[PDB]
Design a protein around this ligand. Structure first.
Ligand SMILES: C=CCNC(=O)c1nc(N[C@@H](C)C(=O)NO)c2ccccc2n1
Ligand SMILES: [Zn+2]
Ligand SMILES: [Zn+2]
Length: 341
């Protein structure tokens, strides 16, 4: 059934709860962002109100074919009333259209649901600065101190420099970026921009990017593969076998592939700083795993929570084992004692 951390107490609201059938007493279903583990269950047959960002709403309409009458997009940073409850959507710094939701409950309690987020100091200057938060539903994906990775900007700097050098040294090299969902678009957009090329992709991926309100997107992306020297492929094809096969389809136009696998955190990232990252190479194909994260590092998560000073924290990730739940509560306790709330 629907887990407790997906229900907002004192309301008829659920968050990211689309795979449990009709949730008893739910009058509005919130969707934090368009990632399959969150929209799972939504389809053209859904007949309840869905509240979300404009971008998420574009994807619901065009990709899942949810009926327009059930899509309720809300602007960011704006007090809105939904079923008699004041709510605000805030940028989650996750993927395009991803939001955190602030609920102002009728009894005076204030709840922040982060959805998925990458905590950032800029969030300390949103509407969050203005009032106390009694409950925090926290994206705890990387809630352990071993989860370190660089900033997104540092990872992009590495990717741009690596691609620019390779193509400047060999104008016949092809750059390939793997993708499986929305998010992490900056990897391929920044590489294509430095190389003066558009990004070539399948019709399905092109359709998805057309829903993202990305400025000047028609100048950046294309389905014309051969006119482009940065190609997007499904993540599962970013291996030597899949890349060798892709190189044949190009028709003697390229003699080298440099490929990027933007992963999340990897244990290798503790040893090797972003500047020391080296690829796996087989012949004329090199594959760079790069730690581009759209979730908070441990340090980013700790800073955000210690600033927010919530009275109670409900984790939404890694909640499956006694060990994982215990470890997270121990960190919350440490953060609270250190900061004094
Ligand atoms: C290792 C931690 C990172 N996060 C997940 O474990 C995760 N991420 C997903 N997609 C990403 C894009 C996302 O951010 N979604 O919200 C999944 C999609 C389908 C099934 C399981 C999924 N697990
Ligand atoms: Zn996500
Ligand atoms: Zn997720």
């Amino acid at each position: 059934t629907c887990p407790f951390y997906k229900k907002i107490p004192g309301t008829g609201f659920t968050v990211d709860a689309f795979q449990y059938g009709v949730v008893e007493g739910c009058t509005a279903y919130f969707l934090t962002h368009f990632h399959s583990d969150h929209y799972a269950g939504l389809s053209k047959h859904f007949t309840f109100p869905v509240y979300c960002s404009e971008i998420t709403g574009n994807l619901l309409k065009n990709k899942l074919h949810v009926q327009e009458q059930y899509i309720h997009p809300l602007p960011l940073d704006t007090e809105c009333i939904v079923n008699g409850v004041k709510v605000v959507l805030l940028d989650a710094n996750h993927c395009p259209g991803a939001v955190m939701i602030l609920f102002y409950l009728p009894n005076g309690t204030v709840i922040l649901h982060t959805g998925d987020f990458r905590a950032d100091p800029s969030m300390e200057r949103s509407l969050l600065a203005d009032q106390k938060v009694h409950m925090l539903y926290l994206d705890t994906t990387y809630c352990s101190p071993e989860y370190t990775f660089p900033s997104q900007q540092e990872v992009i700097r590495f990717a741009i420099n690596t691609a620019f050098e390779a193509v400047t040294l060999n104008p016949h090299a092809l750059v390939v970026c793997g993708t499986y969902s929305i998010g992490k678009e900056k990897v391929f957009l920044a590489i294509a921009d430095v190389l003066g090329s558009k990004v070539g992709m399948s019709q399905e991926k092109y359709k998805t990017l057309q829903c993202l309100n990305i400025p000047e997107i028609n100048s950046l992306i294309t389905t014309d593969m051969c006119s482009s020297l940065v190609h997007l492929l499904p993540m599962m094809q970013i291996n030597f076998k899949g890349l060798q096969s892709h190189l044949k389809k190009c028709g003697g136009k390229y003699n080298q592939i440099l490929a990027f696998r933007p992963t999340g955190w990897t244990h290798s990232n503790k040893f090797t700083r972003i500047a020391d990252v080296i690829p796996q190479t087989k012949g004329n194909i090199s594959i760079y795993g790069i730690p581009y994260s759209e979730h908070s590092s441990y340090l980013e998560m700790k800073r955000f929570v210690q600033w927010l000073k919530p009275q109670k924290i409900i984790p939404t990730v890694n909640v499956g084992t006694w060990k994982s739940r215990s470890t997270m509560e121990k960190y919350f306790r440490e953060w609270k004692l250190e900061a004094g709330y």
